[model samples]
Target chain A: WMEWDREINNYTSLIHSLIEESQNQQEKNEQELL
Target chain B: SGIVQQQNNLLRAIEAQQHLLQLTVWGIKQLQARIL
Candidate 1:
C-alpha cells in the first residue's frame, strides 16, 4: 500500500467499500450532494 | 545543502495526497448532512 493509505484509511473502510463509488466524484463535492 | 532531499520529496508527496484525502472526507460529511 502507499504510505499515507494508512493515514487516509482513518476516514472509512467505507472508502474501501466506496472505493469504486468515488469513481464518479470530484473535489469539494459538498454542494453537489444536495 | 540537500539536507535529506529525498525525504523532503517523500514528505511533499504525502502532503499532496493529504489534500486529496481532506477533500473526500469533507465531501462525505456534506453529503451525509444534506441527505436530500
Candidate 2:
C-alpha cells in the first residue's frame, strides 16, 4: 500500500503562492479603487 | 458495494475539485484587478 502512489509535493507550493498572490492583488486593487 | 464505493470516490473528487476551482477563480479575479 505504501507504494500505491508517490507523494508528490508538486503543486503544494504553487497553491500556496497562488493563494498569497490572490490575496495580495485583491488588497492592492481595493486600495487603488478606493 | 461497487455503487457505494464509486459514490464515495465521486464525493471526494467533487470536494477536491471545488477547492481547486475556488482557488483558481480567486487567483484569476485578483490578476484581473492587478492589470487594471
The best candidate in terms of DockQ: 1
Which pairs in model 1 have colliding backbones?
A: none
Encode model 1's per-residue lDDT on A1-34: one tens digit a residue: 3444566576555544444343333222433544
Report the C-alpha lDDT of model 2 over A1-34, residue by residue, as the tens digit. 1221112222344455555555565566567667
Candidate topping lDDT: 1
Q: Point out the worst 10-residue segment of candidate 2 chain A by lDDT.
A: A1-10
Return the lDDT, model 1, position A29: 44
The regions of model 2 sitting more than 4 angstroms off are A1-34
Give me candidate 2's TM-score against the actual structure. Answer: 0.49
Q: List the residue pairs that clash in candidate 2.
A: none
Clashes of each: 0, 0
* DockQ, cand. 2: 0.02
The iRMS of the candidates, in order, is 13.8, 14.9
CAPRI tier for the interface of model 1: incorrect
TM-score of chain B of each: 0.70, 0.81
